[PDB]
Amino acid sequence: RKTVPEFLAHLKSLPISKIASNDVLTICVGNESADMDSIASAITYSYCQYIYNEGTYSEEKKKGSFIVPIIDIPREDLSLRRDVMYVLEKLKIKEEELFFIEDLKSLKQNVSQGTELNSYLVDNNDTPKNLKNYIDNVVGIIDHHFDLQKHLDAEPRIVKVSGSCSSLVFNYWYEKLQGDREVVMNIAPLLMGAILIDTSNMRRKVEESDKLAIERCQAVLSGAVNEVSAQGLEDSSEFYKEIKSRKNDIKGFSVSDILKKDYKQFNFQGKGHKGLEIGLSSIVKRMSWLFNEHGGEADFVNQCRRFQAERGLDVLVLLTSWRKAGDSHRELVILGDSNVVRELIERVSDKLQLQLFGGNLDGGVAMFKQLNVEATRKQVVPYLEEAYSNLEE
Ligand SMILES: [Mn+2]
């Protein structure tokens, strides 16, 4: 019975032909932002599949093959997620045991050209754009984002409301593993990392899936007890503070690091035959902090324009958020051609309750207080998409 690092090291020790089966190599990948949820969900799916197939739950059912968990970023970018590093350290998962974009490319390169590369998707429901030329078929989906209604024949195909995708992944596998306590012990830090960050320690965005996953972890982590003490929840709170603090820590990172470490890119289809290439970076510190840490407004904006150019974007959006004295604050900063950016912002300003504090839409760089403090990137993207659909051409 291998632990999670032992399972990962075992995959690393195998020839690709023993990972693949009948000319199919199967992976599981999260989304291009590679946050805690994407990383935890991918590793969990893959590890649970391994345990399931090796065990007696799968008897008189038949056993597939290994699933390689993928983290969809360059290996070097892992360190930008200090919260994730901390949680991986708790499980003794070494970075050299994990599989990143480089590894997936080496896989695709080192396997025969006739071998199909099929993917489970977790924390997304269509293939990340950067992997479209690597992945042949989507075979299963577990996600909690807007349902794009693709891959309707996926097995499983779970796209449902959840604070954390990881809750859905875990509950799915927990049933199949008949509550296997060892598995739960072996993944709990990674699972709870994702659930607690995504739900702000089970205080925001909580759904029945998250409540169930937590209940299941508590039962195991407690073991045999005559009464339930406060200690488990106290430990959960200390762990939350550690991960939240580290997610909130971007000191010492470059502007490019900050922009790329929680980033999603889209192409919006509009009335024009050419779409809008748009990237959105979600950031944990306010603009004045960012400026002060990065040589000032001018220097900071210069580095943003560089990142925009490098990623081939028509529009770059920065979404900041933070909490102070118990209250949420948000800002939205947009960079792009004055025409498109003015029209987009003018169409979403009411819903997002945007108040200009710097720049000018006509210059193509503008900075807004966002008084709709409930709206995250998950909401902002469709608002912008709708706005873009209304633009003439
Ligand atoms: Mn998620």
From Swiss-Prot:
It is an enzyme of class 3 (hydrolase). ATP binds at residues 145, 282, 377. Mg(2+) binds at residues 37, 123, 144. Its cofactor is Mn(2+); Mg(2+). It catalyses: [phosphate](n) + H2O = [phosphate](n-1) + phosphate + H(+). One of its GO terms (molecular function) is ATP binding. Transmembrane segments: none annotated. One of its GO terms (cellular component) is cytoplasm. It comes from the Eukaryota. Mn(2+) binds at residues 37, 123, 144. Gene3D superfamilies: DHHA2 domain, inorganic pyrophosphatase (n-terminal core). GO terms for biological process: polyphosphate catabolic process. Keywords: ATP-binding, Hydrolase, Magnesium, Manganese, Metal-binding, Nucleotide-binding. Its EC number is 3.6.1.11. Present with 3170 molecules/cell in log phase SD medium. Polyphosphatase (polyPase) involved in the degradation of inorganic polyphosphates (polyP) that is able to degrade a range of chains from three to several hundreds of residues in a highly processive manner. Exclusively shows exopolyphosphatase activity, cleaving inside the polyP chain. Belongs to the PPase class C family. PANTHER family: BNIP - RELATED, EG:152A3.5 PROTEIN (FBGN0003116_PN PROTEIN). This is Polyphosphatase. It comes from Saccharomyces cerevisiae (strain ATCC 204508 / S288c) (Baker's yeast). The gene is PPX1.
